[PDB]
Design an enzyme around this catalytic site. Structure first.
Site, PDB file in Angstrom:
ATOM      1  N   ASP A  43       0.677  -1.218  -0.024  1.00  0.00           N
ATOM      2  CA  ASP A  43      -0.170   0.143   0.139  1.00  0.00           C
ATOM      3  C   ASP A  43       0.742   1.137   0.066  1.00  0.00           C
ATOM      4  O   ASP A  43       0.299   2.284  -0.657  1.00  0.00           O
ATOM      5  CB  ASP A  43      -0.948   0.127   1.393  1.00  0.00           C
ATOM      6  CG  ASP A  43      -1.909   1.030   1.183  1.00  0.00           C
ATOM      7  OD1 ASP A  43      -2.655   1.401   0.189  1.00  0.00           O
ATOM      8  OD2 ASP A  43      -1.789   2.073   1.946  1.00  0.00           O
ATOM      9  N   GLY A  99     -10.009  -5.147 -15.916  1.00  0.00           N
ATOM     10  CA  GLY A  99      -9.105  -5.840 -16.954  1.00  0.00           C
ATOM     11  C   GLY A  99      -9.229  -7.153 -17.322  1.00  0.00           C
ATOM     12  O   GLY A  99     -10.076  -7.767 -16.456  1.00  0.00           O
ATOM     13  N   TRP A 100      -8.532  -7.632 -18.077  1.00  0.00           N
ATOM     14  CA  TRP A 100      -8.718  -9.029 -18.510  1.00  0.00           C
ATOM     15  C   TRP A 100      -8.408 -10.054 -17.232  1.00  0.00           C
ATOM     16  O   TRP A 100      -9.206 -10.796 -17.135  1.00  0.00           O
ATOM     17  CB  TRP A 100      -8.014  -9.681 -20.041  1.00  0.00           C
ATOM     18  CG  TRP A 100      -8.356 -10.892 -20.268  1.00  0.00           C
ATOM     19  CD1 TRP A 100      -7.600 -11.896 -19.787  1.00  0.00           C
ATOM     20  CD2 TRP A 100      -9.311 -11.281 -20.837  1.00  0.00           C
ATOM     21  NE1 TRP A 100      -8.035 -13.053 -20.533  1.00  0.00           N
ATOM     22  CE2 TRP A 100      -9.058 -12.785 -21.014  1.00  0.00           C
ATOM     23  CE3 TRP A 100     -10.354 -10.714 -21.688  1.00  0.00           C
ATOM     24  CZ2 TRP A 100     -10.074 -13.521 -22.036  1.00  0.00           C
ATOM     25  CZ3 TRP A 100     -11.376 -11.446 -22.314  1.00  0.00           C
ATOM     26  CH2 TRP A 100     -11.172 -12.906 -22.340  1.00  0.00           C
ATOM     27  N   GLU A 139     -14.324  -7.206 -18.604  1.00  0.00           N
ATOM     28  CA  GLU A 139     -14.386  -7.785 -20.009  1.00  0.00           C
ATOM     29  C   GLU A 139     -15.086  -9.423 -19.792  1.00  0.00           C
ATOM     30  O   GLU A 139     -14.126 -10.107 -19.765  1.00  0.00           O
ATOM     31  CB  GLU A 139     -12.946  -7.758 -20.466  1.00  0.00           C
ATOM     32  CG  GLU A 139     -12.431  -6.335 -20.546  1.00  0.00           C
ATOM     33  CD  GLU A 139     -10.989  -6.257 -20.956  1.00  0.00           C
ATOM     34  OE1 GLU A 139     -10.730  -7.090 -21.570  1.00  0.00           O
ATOM     35  OE2 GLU A 139     -10.197  -5.107 -20.634  1.00  0.00           O
ATOM     36  N   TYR A 140     -15.915  -9.512 -20.106  1.00  0.00           N
ATOM     37  CA  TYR A 140     -17.262  -8.488 -20.001  1.00  0.00           C
ATOM     38  C   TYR A 140     -18.425  -8.993 -19.303  1.00  0.00           C
ATOM     39  O   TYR A 140     -18.445 -10.106 -19.046  1.00  0.00           O
ATOM     40  CB  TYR A 140     -17.622  -8.241 -21.634  1.00  0.00           C
ATOM     41  CG  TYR A 140     -16.584  -7.736 -22.450  1.00  0.00           C
ATOM     42  CD1 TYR A 140     -16.360  -6.278 -22.926  1.00  0.00           C
ATOM     43  CD2 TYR A 140     -15.354  -8.704 -22.910  1.00  0.00           C
ATOM     44  CE1 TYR A 140     -15.294  -6.063 -23.489  1.00  0.00           C
ATOM     45  CE2 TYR A 140     -14.268  -8.357 -23.580  1.00  0.00           C
ATOM     46  CZ  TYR A 140     -14.333  -6.703 -24.026  1.00  0.00           C
ATOM     47  OH  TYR A 140     -13.195  -6.279 -24.690  1.00  0.00           O
ATOM     48  N   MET A 159     -12.529  -0.557 -27.069  1.00  0.00           N
ATOM     49  CA  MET A 159     -11.036  -1.084 -27.204  1.00  0.00           C
ATOM     50  C   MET A 159     -10.971  -1.781 -28.830  1.00  0.00           C
ATOM     51  O   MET A 159     -10.988  -2.834 -29.031  1.00  0.00           O
ATOM     52  CB  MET A 159     -11.101  -2.354 -26.282  1.00  0.00           C
ATOM     53  CG  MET A 159     -10.939  -1.883 -24.723  1.00  0.00           C
ATOM     54  SD  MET A 159     -10.940  -3.130 -23.639  1.00  0.00           S
ATOM     55  CE  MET A 159     -12.474  -3.632 -23.364  1.00  0.00           C
TER      56      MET A 159
END
Lengths: 5, 496
Positions: free
Chosen positions: B66, B94-95, B142-143, B210
């Site tokens: 952190d 994110g993926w 996603e997604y 994207m």
């Protein structure tokens, strides 16, 4: 993308 | 109004924990690389990525140090001293975290399930925002699948409500807190929520398409990953949108979604504009700051559209690093992808690469005659066409993945900024070419036409045009005797 991302 | 220039800034959790601005082998692209000159060229930096934990709240990856995190974020927010319009957003998802089989997928589905979970999630979003000093929220799931969409929409509406409240409470009328999402840039993933685009985009300041990864080793033939327009010689795809739960007639579906079609950036943009309630100003075109490589390809067309022998298997098998000159690929264990920074260096080397240009797609590509290699990527030249397109279509701006892949001089970012704001750059003569345009027509992009006012009680033959309820209609067959909107024989084909 697209599993590595 | 100024076009947005949104750069995702991604830093692996391990680089955060070992942050340093003096050793590129540890942190290839630390914040210090973003000089004041570059801070001024950006309007948004999307810090990536935060996730959604098991308590169904926005949160940093548990393994994150952190103190190191806040230090990196603080360095990013300090950049605002050089640009009063700059916003440091944080992206959730994110993926890796959110894909269907991602390490945190269930948290996403569960976070938006109920009013309570939605209120709890939204509050954590705003809490994280004010806690770390961010300027807005970007959701990159996603997604969401079709069944989770209504919850998704409701979640966005809730965040919007809280952000607008926070903006007032913090006197930020000059630089309001914002809400955006990274949206699909290809019809297959877009089909999951396409029918409800208008509701998804309503609470947003921008939807960042994207519009990249439209090609890759997972496909049968090599192709450009972000062609602006289509090339008749390249592969085409099934138009998945024609299968969306839209409730449209065969005739409407067919004209809005020709199939097969060319998977291009223009197709994704036009597909969003075809829907009513999706303003051009909120659409942001994504561009890649990296390329994708294929091996074992054949010559004849510079490596384009050839069969290949590239493992589409994600965690690249073997330690066979066939991408010549790409030292980065060795560092990251994957020769199928390389940053523009690395590619530029491979080009100026003598690794046997030839840069070619496709005048239909308006994109460059590399061909290694030996080894049989093909690389699809974008550069400052392709960005000229994409920037002109953004201006002509009145889009909100450009977005890119990702800042850490630009070269040291920040050439790709500078080019985008130049095309939009340099007083001495003039693209009035730039020719957009003859590449295939997506011709779909929908409720949101009906063309102006003109026609006589429909006359009640009158019978019209096939092909007749008439005006009614502010629209122009055409008959689908002959001997019509009922009114538009009241007789399926009429097809709405134009406005005013």
């Amino acid at each position: 993308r697209f599993x590595x991302x | 109004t100024r076009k947005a220039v949104i750069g995702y800034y991604f830093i692996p959790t391990n680089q955060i924990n070992n942050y340093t601005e003096t050793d590129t082998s540890v942190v290839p692209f630390p914040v210090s690389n973003i000089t004041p000159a570059k801070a001024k060229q950006l309007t948004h930096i999307n810090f990536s990525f935060l996730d959604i934990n098991s308590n169904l709240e926005c949160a940093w990856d548990p393994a994150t140090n952190d103190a190191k995190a806040r230090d990196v974020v603080n360095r990013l927010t300090a950049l605002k001293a050089h640009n009063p319009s700059l916003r440091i957003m944080f992206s959730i998802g994110g993926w890796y975290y959110s894909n269907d089989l991602g390490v945190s997928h269930a948290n996403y589905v569960n976070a938006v399930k109920t009013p309570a979970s939605r209120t709890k999630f939204a509050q954590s979003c705003v809490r994280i925002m004010k806690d770390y000093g961010f300027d807005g929220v970007d959701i990159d799931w996603e997604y969401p699948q079709a069944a989770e969409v209504d919850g998704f929409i409701a979640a966005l509406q809730e965040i919007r409500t809280l952000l607008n409240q926070q903006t007032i409470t913090d006197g930020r009328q000059a630089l309001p807190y914002q809400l955006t999402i990274a949206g699909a840039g290809g019809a297959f993933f877009l089909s999951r929520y396409y029918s409800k685009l208008a509701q998804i985009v309503a609470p947003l300041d921008y939807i960042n398409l994207m519009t990249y990864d439209l090609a890759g080793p997972w496909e049968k033939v090599t192709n450009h990953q972000a062609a602006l327009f289509g090339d008749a010689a390249g592969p085409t795809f099934y138009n998945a949108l024609r299968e969306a739960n839209l409730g449209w007639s065969w005739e409407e579906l067919t004209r809005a979604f020709p199939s097969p079609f060319s998977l291009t950036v223009d197709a994704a943009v036009q597909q969003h504009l075809m829907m009513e309630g999706v303003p051009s100003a909120k659409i942001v075109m994504g561009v890649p700051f990296y390329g994708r490589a294929f091996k074992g390809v054949s010559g004849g067309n510079g490596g384009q559209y050839s069969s290949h022998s590239t493992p589409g298997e994600d965690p690249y098998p073997s330690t066979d690093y066939w991408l010549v000159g790409c030292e980065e690929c060795v560092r990251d264990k994957d020769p199928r992808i390389a940053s523009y920074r690395q590619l530029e260096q491979m080009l100026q080397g003598n690794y046997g690469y030839q840069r070619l240009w496709n005048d239909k797609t308006k994109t460059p590509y590399l061909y290694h005659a030996q080894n049989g290699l093909f690389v699809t990527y974008d550069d400052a030249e392709s960005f000229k066409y994409k920037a002109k397109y953004i201006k002509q279509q009145q889009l909100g701006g450009v977005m890119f993945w990702h800042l850490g892949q630009d070269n040291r001089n920040g050439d790709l970012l500078a080019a985008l900024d130049r095309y939009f704001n340099a007083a001495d750059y003039d693209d009035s003569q730039l020719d957009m070419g003859t590449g295939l345009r997506y011709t779909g027509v929908g409720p949101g992009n009906l063309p102006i036409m003109t026609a006589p006012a429909y006359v009640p009680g009158t019978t019209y033959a096939q092909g007749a045009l008439v005006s009614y309820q502010g629209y122009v209609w055409q008959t689908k067959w002959g001997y019509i005797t009922s009114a538009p909107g009241s007789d399926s024989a009429w097809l709405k084909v134009g406005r005013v």
